[model samples]
Target chain A: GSELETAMETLINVFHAHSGKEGDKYKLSKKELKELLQTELSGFLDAQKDADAVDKVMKELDEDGDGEVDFQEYVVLVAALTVACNNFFWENS
Target chain B: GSELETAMETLINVFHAHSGKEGDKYKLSKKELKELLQTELSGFLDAQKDADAVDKVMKELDEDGDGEVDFQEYVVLVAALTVACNNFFWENS
Candidate 1:
């Protein structure tokens, strides 16, 4: 796998590892999602002022109101966050 | 940054590295996009039969019809590929 493919693998593997921790193996429960954010996105999480950021993020990512984040929903969030980060980078440069 | 953030960063960095090869530094020219798909996605590319796959892919990704893939388009492709791979993984498992 190339660097990009490896990165893509990381995204899927990371999600599966956390999502499989509890509840549906293919979807991320609230607790699972929070732990994922805490463990895998702490760098991005540092700017949060709201202690309930996970709840807010969970609400945002659960597009179907299923009380969980499915792969599609999770992927959408990742794409959006990455796009925002890219925009921020270019704009700042 | 964590594993997920590193992955996300890879997506951006890889795109910028290729997109900067020519034309707009923020967008991927056809040649640049081809190089990227070949370099980063060759494992997946081994299955392609069409010699013009890159052209087809470029058309599919250029949502704005600007003849180039921007970061947003590239991220969408990565997300789509990753999600599809996840589906395949769970289905096979």
Candidate 2:
């Protein structure tokens, strides 16, 4: 395709756009991210009625203790994205 | 085996619940279907910075002009979904 002339602008634009849509909760506050994870990402976690257990897992994933997840920390949290979800995106990968 | 069977039943129940939510828009109005598609699917249409691009795409896929897209038209629309998404699907087959 084309050369790498567009990487900086394109990535910044995508970051801004996706942030507007999905929020930067993970980067801003681990507590907010954990709440969202329990409710939105893993319905089973709440359905199991084990908030403390899920909080323990979230705390463990929040390695830096800075109350925020950088990209590397996010990879750990989003590990199941590559494994679960019956959708073809994960199934083929 | 028992755990897997339970998981299978959970999935089937989920499918049934989701189906209860899906409306027969094709049998009704295409306008309603596109509105639902846009609201529900969110950002499935990639790189479409222009607002009218989706409207153009909608027109192209909606060959019969009845408004709602059939399974066949959906195939035509997502033709590039596999190759472009950094993964592949056995979609054509």
Candidate 3:
């Protein structure tokens, strides 16, 4: 119940928390988002982990693709990372 | 209870507050942080009793082993010194 309860509010809370007032948080335009993400995730996504894979991951969070990740998107990204880490590095128990 | 809560949550809040999200309240970037420390801690880390050890300290803090520190790692390392100073140098007695 605790996990589910917390998880239920995950998307909306993250979204609003990050969005800030009047889209002030992610002022970076979609063009900026593309360039910025390219720089931050260059090494990680370059091995063909683009949109279908990495893009899917980022887009799910940054649904708008506006070069900036609002709070909800950030949460999703963080959550997805655990999955990614386990899949790539940690041997599943 | 109040003190303990503040103590426990201090680091997380520090990280969040200072760490830049893709938002309006952008925290300092890695390069900017370095410039800051060189100006602030320049007096401390640089003025060590032993000039010989300065390079050693710098080398270690560069967690990437890239000869320079990024924001995340530097925040943590500086955090340690902050607490240490508050304990040793900040005591009234």
Error of 3 at B66 (Å): 45
Looking at candidate 1 chain A, the ten consecutive residues that score lowest on lDDT are A48-57
Best by lDDT: 1
Better of 2 and 3 by DockQ: 2
Per-residue lDDT of model 1, residues B1-93, tens digit only: 276677666776766564443444565555555567567667765654344433444556555455665555565455555555455446623
Once fitted onto the true fold, the runs of candidate 2 whose alpha carbons sit more than 4 angstroms away are: A1-18, A21-26, A41-43, A50-56, A61-65, A80-93, B1-93
Question: Residue-wise lDDT of candidate 2 within B14-55, one digit each (tens)?
Answer: 223334334442232455334433443445444443344455
Colliding pairs, model 1? none
**Model 1 alpha-carbon drift over 4 Å, by segment:** A19-25, A29-35, A47-59, A62-68, A83-89, B19-25, B29-35, B47-69, B86-89
Q: Against the hidden reference, what TM-scores do the models get?
A: 0.60, 0.26, 0.27
Please give the lDDT score at residue A90 for candidate 2.
19
Residues A1-93, candidate 1, lDDT per residue (tens digit)? 366677667777776564443444565565555566567667666654344533444556455454665554454455556665455445523
Docking class of 3: incorrect
Q: What is the C-alpha RMSD of each candidate to the true structure, in Å?
A: 5.7, 16.7, 19.3
Candidate 3 residues lying further than 4 Å off, grouped into runs, are: A1-26, A48-52, A65-79, B1-93
Tens-digit lDDT string for candidate 3 (A1-93): 112122323333333343334434335454444444455445654654623555555565366653444322233333343334323432433
lDDT of 3 by residue, B1-93 (tens): 112112222323333344333343334444554555565445555544344433443444444443444333343334333333323433443
